[PDB]
Amino acid sequence: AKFSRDFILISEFKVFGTFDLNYFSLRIMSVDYQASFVGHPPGSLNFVEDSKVVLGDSKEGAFAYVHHLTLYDRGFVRPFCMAYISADQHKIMQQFQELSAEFSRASECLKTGNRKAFAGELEKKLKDLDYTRTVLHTETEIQKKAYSSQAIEKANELASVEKSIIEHQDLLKQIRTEYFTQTLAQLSHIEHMFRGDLCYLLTSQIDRALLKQQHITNFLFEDFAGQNALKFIQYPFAHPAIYSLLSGRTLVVLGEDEAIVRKLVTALAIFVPSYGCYAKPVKHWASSPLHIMDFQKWKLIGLQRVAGTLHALSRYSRYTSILDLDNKTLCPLYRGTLVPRLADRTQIKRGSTYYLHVQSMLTQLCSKAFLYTFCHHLHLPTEELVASRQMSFLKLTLGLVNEDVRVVQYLAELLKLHYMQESPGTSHPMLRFDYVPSFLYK
Amino acid sequence: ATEMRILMVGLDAAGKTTILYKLKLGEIVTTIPTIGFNVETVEYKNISFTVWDVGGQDKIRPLWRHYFQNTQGLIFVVDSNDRERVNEAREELMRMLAEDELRDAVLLVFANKQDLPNAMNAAEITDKLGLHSLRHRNWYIQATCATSGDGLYEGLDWLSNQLRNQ
Amino acid sequence: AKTEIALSGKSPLLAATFAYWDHIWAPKTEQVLLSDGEITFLANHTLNGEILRNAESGAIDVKFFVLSEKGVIIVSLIFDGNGDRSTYGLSIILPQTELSFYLPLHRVCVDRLTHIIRKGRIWMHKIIPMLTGEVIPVMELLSSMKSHSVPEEIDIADTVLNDDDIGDSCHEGFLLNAISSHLQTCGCSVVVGSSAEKVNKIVRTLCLFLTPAERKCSRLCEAESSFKYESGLFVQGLLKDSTGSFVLPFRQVMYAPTHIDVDVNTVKQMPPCDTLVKAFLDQVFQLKPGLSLRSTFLAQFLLVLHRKALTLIKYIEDDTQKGKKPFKSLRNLKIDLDLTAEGDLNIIMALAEKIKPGLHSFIFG
Amino acid sequence: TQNPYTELLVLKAHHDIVRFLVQLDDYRFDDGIVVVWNAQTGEKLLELNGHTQKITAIITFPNQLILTASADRTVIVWDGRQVQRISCFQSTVKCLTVLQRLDVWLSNDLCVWNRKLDLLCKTSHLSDTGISALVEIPKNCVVAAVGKELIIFRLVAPSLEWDILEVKRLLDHQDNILSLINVNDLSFVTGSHVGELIIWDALDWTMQAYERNFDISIHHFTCDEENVFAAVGRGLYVYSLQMKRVIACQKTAHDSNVLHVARLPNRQLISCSEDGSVRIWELREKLELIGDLIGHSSSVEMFLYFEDHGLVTCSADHLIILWKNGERESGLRSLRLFQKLEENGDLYL
Ligand SMILES: Nc1nc2c(ncn2[C@@H]2O[C@H](COP(=O)(O)OP(=O)(O)O)[C@@H](O)[C@H]2O)c(=O)[nH]1
Ligand code: BEF
Ligand SMILES: [Mg+2]
C-alpha cells in the first residue's frame, strides 16, 4: 500500500532514484500502470508544461513535468516525463512552489545538454551526407562528363535533404555522459531533503524564516547526544552543574577513563553559551599543569588522574568548579527555579525529544536577556538607587527567584560586548568572576 | 440521420492520422504519434462521419476495448508494406471481433499504403486477412494511397450504401 | 454562449466553464488577450483526458494545469453523473503572471466548488439557474482579494503596538483577551467594526501573529461594498451597516474547522472551531518602540510558541508507535511540558493543527 | 565579602619576567623587550625592542617618551617611532633619576647629562660596586648608597658649569643598603640588608632613629607625612614616624617574603609577596584583611595604580593582569551603546 518517489518514462511502440534503484516498491503500485495513466495529450521549440494527477487505489499523483528530450533519428518527438509521486496528498499542493524550481533546474540541465548531443549527431550526419555529396559531385559528375539522369535526380534529392539538415542545424543552435551524471545527481538531491513528512517540512521553513530577523540574539545557541545526556539527568545531585555551566564558571572535569570523559564533554556542550564567530569555547582532553590564561577562552576542560591534584587545583577554587568522576565529588549552594524545570523525575523517553525541549526553553532566556539589555528606563539614570532598581526589576517584571538572577546579567554582558566588539574575550580577555563561597557534595 | 461513429484503428506507424487529415483538409503535415486520441468529423452526402484517431501502440493494444461503445462502423486499417507481424495483427483483429460487446457493430476491413512494389494487389493481402474465413461479418476493402489521396472516397461511399439500411 | 458579467475591481479571473461527450461564463472587460475559441481549445485538453472511468461512488478529483504553452493556469474538479451516466465538472482559468496568488487560496476554492457541485448534483436527479447562481460568489471572493488583504511584510506602523501607552483598565483586558482568543481559535477570526480606520488598524495589528503565507489568506476591511462571512479565510475585516445586525449565516460559520468589535469592545468566541501571552502583553510596552527594538522581541514569543508546539507533537507521536495504542497520559504530559495552565496547554495545542491535522481528535477528541 | 575588582583582564606578550612598570602619560604607561599598552582597551599599542641583555631601569623625561638602560654597558634613548640616541661611557649603571627643579638628569661612577643626551659632568671612580640607589634631595643635592657605605654626593649648581662635591659620609649601618625614599621634605629613611632601620636628617644629616626589635632583609618601605610602613620577609610591620616606635604589626602575613608595598590614595595599603598572592590592607585605629587577589603561580614584582582604571600586577609567569572594578566598568559600557544606537538609527542598519 505504498508508492515510489521518482519515475521517468517514454512511451512508444523506467529509472529510479528513491534509494538508487531501491528494491522496495511494494506490490500495490505497478511499475508501468501509472506510466500508462500519465500518458496524456499535454504537449502539442515548445516549452515547459507542469501538471498534477488525480487519486486512485491508492496513491495520489504529484508533479509530472513533461518535456521533450531532443532531436532523435518522429522528427523531434521525445515524450520524457520526470514524474514525481508521494503518498501524502496535501503535501505536493502545499509545497508546489518550492518543488517546482528544483525539477525546473533539473530539466533545464537536460535541455542545455542533450540538445547539444543531438547537435553532434546532426553535425556528423550532414558531415557524412556532405561527404557523400562531394563524392557524387566529383565522381558522378566526372562520369556525366564521361542512367545518369537517375544519378542527377538522386543528387538533387540529396541536396534538398542537405539543405533541410542545414536549416535544422541552424535553428537548433538558437538560445531556446557529460551531462547525465550531474542530472542524476541533482535528481538525487531533489529526493534528499523531502523524505520527511510535510509536518516537519512546514516547521523547517517557518523557523528558517523567523531566525533571519533575530540576528543579534541568535549567537548563543544557533549551533553552527541526548540518551547519554538524559542519563546525566541517573546521576544525582547534578543540577548545580547546569547552573555552573550557564553562569560562566568553568566546569573542569577531571579523571581517567577517556571514554566516559568524551561521552560527557560533548553531551553537556549543548548548555554552553557561545562567545562569537568561534563555534564553541570547549576544550577536549586538556593535559597540563594549567595556567590562568588557559581558563580565559577555554570555557571548560578535561583533565586526567595519572595514578593528588586536588590541592594543586584547589588554589584556583574561586574561578572554577571541580568535577571528579570516580569519587562522585563535585559549585555554590543553589536553590533556584530556572534550571530544575530545565532538567527534572521526568517520564520523557527518547533522545532527541529532550533536545528540542532544551532548545525551546533556552531561547526564552535569550529573549529575557534582550529585554534586560535594551530597556531604557533601567540603564539610563546614585549607585545605591540604580542598584536597588536593577535588583528589584527582576523581582517583579521577569519573575526570577533569588540567585537565579546572576545568569541574566552575564548573558546581558555577552550581548553588549557582542554589539560593539563581536569578540568578547578572544582578543580582549574579560574573565568575569565573583566571590561566592562553595561547598562539596559526596 | 447524419451521425456516423467510426472506431478508426490501426497498427503502429500506419499513417491513419494522415488518413484523417486527408479526409478533413486534404493536406499533408508531419505527425507526432498521437498519445490518447483525436476527435474530428467529416460531413459527406448528408451524413456527418465522426472519426476518432487512436493509437496503435502494443502497450495500449489491450486498451481499445475502452472505446468499444457507441461506434457502429468498426473501420480498421492494416499496413501492407510491413510483411511482418501480420499474424499478430490478424490475432488482434479476431480477438477484437470475437466479443459480443462489439457484436452489434458491423465489420469493415480496410487497407492502405500501396507504395513500393513489394506490396501488390490485395489478393494475398486479403488472403492473409482471411475474408472468406469469417462468419457473420461484412468486409469490403480498397487500395488507397495518401500521397495521391485517392480511394478513401469510395470507402465512404460503400460505408454509406451498405449501412444506411440499418 | 459566454454570458459576460462584471464586478467591482480589476479582474484576476480570465474565464470559467463546463464539459460534454457524443465556457458560458466570462470576466467582461476590455480587450481580452485570448480569443473565445482559445477557451474552448484549452477546455478540450483538460476535459478529453478521462477515458479510464475508474470511480467507485463519486468524488472531486481536483486537477491543476500550469500549461506554459500559452501561459494559463487551469483548475478543475471532474465528477461522474442528465440522460446518461457521463462525467463532467466545472473549470476555472487564471493568467500566468498571477501565479503565486492562487496557491494559498486553493484549499478554499476547492471547498467552495465542492459545495457548489454537491448542490448541483442534488437538483440533477430530483441545470443552469443554479449554475449561474452559484458561480458569481466564487468569482466574487477571488476577485475581491486582488487588491486587498494584509500582505506578509507588515510593519508596526499601524499596529496596536507602537503606541507608547499601555492603555487603561479596559484597554489592557480587551487586548489581552483578544490575543488569547485568537491564539486559542487556531488563527481564524474576523473583526466587526463601525468605523473604517479603526477596523483596518486593529486588523493589521492582529495580523502580525501569523505566517507570511497565511497573510494572503485574509480579507481587508472597507466601507464601500458589502462583504460576506467567507468561511475559508483566517482574518477578515468588514464594516457593519447602520441596521444593527451583522450578516452572518449560522450554517456557513459553524461548518468551519470569533467576534471582536471596535465599538462596544467585547470579544466573544461564540462559535467554536493563560499566562504566557499575559507576560508578553505586560512586557512589550516597557520598551522604546521608535528604534525598532520592540519589533525584534515580537518574533521571540512566536518562535517559542512554535517550538513548544512541535515538541508536544513529537512527545505525543513517540509515546506511541506513530499511533498504535491509547494515550491515557495527561498529568505526565502536562507536568513535563512546562505548561500547567489549561490556557497555555490549549495555546500550545493550537499551533499543532496547522502542521498535523486531526491531532485534537487523536489526543482527546 | 566586600572588596573591589570583580573583573580580570589578562595580557600575554612577553618572553621573560619584566620587573619594571613606569607611567608614561594619561592613557599609556628580563629579555630586553619594551612593550606599552592601553589601560582601558588592553591593546598592545606599538612595541620597542632594541636591547640584548636584561634591562636595568626605565624612566620618563617630560617628550616624556622613554628612557631605558640594560646590562650591555650602554644607555639608549627610545621614543614614540625612531630612537633618539644611545650613550655608552665605560661601565653599566643600575640606577637613574631625573631632577625636575634643576631641569637636569643623571645616571661605579655618577654621570649627569643634559637634555641633549651629553654628559655635563661625571665623577671619578666612586667605588668597586655600583650605585644601589639615587634619591633626590633638597637644595640640588643627590644622595646615593653604595652597599655598606652611603655618601651624599652633592651637586653644585653652575663660570656657568655644573660641579659636584660629596659633603658627607656615614658608617652607622653594619650591612648593605636596601632602599631609601624621601618622605616629603622631612628626612631620608635608611635600611640595612641585615634588617636595621635608620633615618637621615634633611639639613642636619644627623641619624635620629634605629629600630632592631623585629631572614631579616626588609626590601621596600612606603611612607608619607603620616607614618612609615615597611615589609620584611613574612611580616608587615609599621614603624611610627612622629612618635618613633612600631605602630602596627602583623605576624601572620603572607607565607612567602614580601617584595613591594605601597599605599593607595584613598587610605589603604596593598602588599606584594613572593608566593604570588597580593592582598589589600586598610589602616585602622591601631588594620585588618581587606581582600584577596590570587593571580599567578609565582611571584609578582611591583604594582602600579591608575586613578580610574585599576591595577597592574605581574612579574614572573610571563604575564600581565589589569584588575578592574567591574560594576563601575559595566556602567561605562552601557553608556556607550545607547549613545551609539541613536546616532546609528535602528538596531541592524
Ligand atoms: N509513402 C507513404 N507513406 C505513408 C502512406 N500512408 C502513411 N504514410 C506514412 O505514415 C507516417 C505517419 O504515421 P503516423 O500518423 O504517425 O501513424 P498512424 O497514424 O497510426 O498511421 C507518415 O510519415 C507517412 O510517410 C502512404 O500511402 N505512402
Ligand atoms: F497516428 Be497515431 F498512430 F494515432
Ligand atoms: Mg500514428
Author numbering:
A (entry chain B): 51 to 63, 80 to 110, 115 to 143, 147 to 219, 225 to 254, 328 to 375, 706 to 714, 716 to 789, ...
B (entry chain E): 15 to 180
C (entry chain C): 13 to 34, 43 to 101, 104 to 148, 172 to 302, 306 to 321, 374 to 465
D (entry chain A): 29 to 57, 62 to 94, 103 to 120, 124 to 150, 153 to 203, 207 to 262, 283 to 354, 395 to 457
What did the paper state?
Mutation of C9ORF72 is the most common genetic cause of amyotrophic lateral sclerosis (ALS) and frontal temporal degeneration (FTD), which is attributed to both a gain and loss of function. C9orf72 forms a complex with SMCR8 and WDR41, which was reported to have GTPase activating protein activity toward ARF proteins, RAB8A, and RAB11A. Two cryo-electron microscopy structural studies of the C9orf72:SMCR8:WDR41 complex found that SMCR8 is sandwiched between C9orf72 and WDR41.
We were able to obtain a 3.9-Å cryo-EM reconstruction from an untilted dataset combined with 30° and 40° stage tilted datasets. The reconstruction showed that ARF1 sits in a 25 Å-wide concave pocket generated by the SMCR8longin and C9orf72longin domains. Relative to C9orf72, SMCR8longin has the more extensive interface with ARF1. ARF1 is in its GTP-bound conformation, with respect to all three of the regions whose conformation depends on the nucleotide state: the switch I, switch II, and interswitch regions. SMCR8 Arg147 points directly toward the BeF3−, as predicted by the arginine finger model (left). ARF1 switch II sits on the parallel helices of the two longin domains and the loop of SMCR8longin, while switch I binds only to SMCR8longin. Our observation of a catalytically competent monomeric complex does show that the monomer is the minimal entity capable of GAP activity.
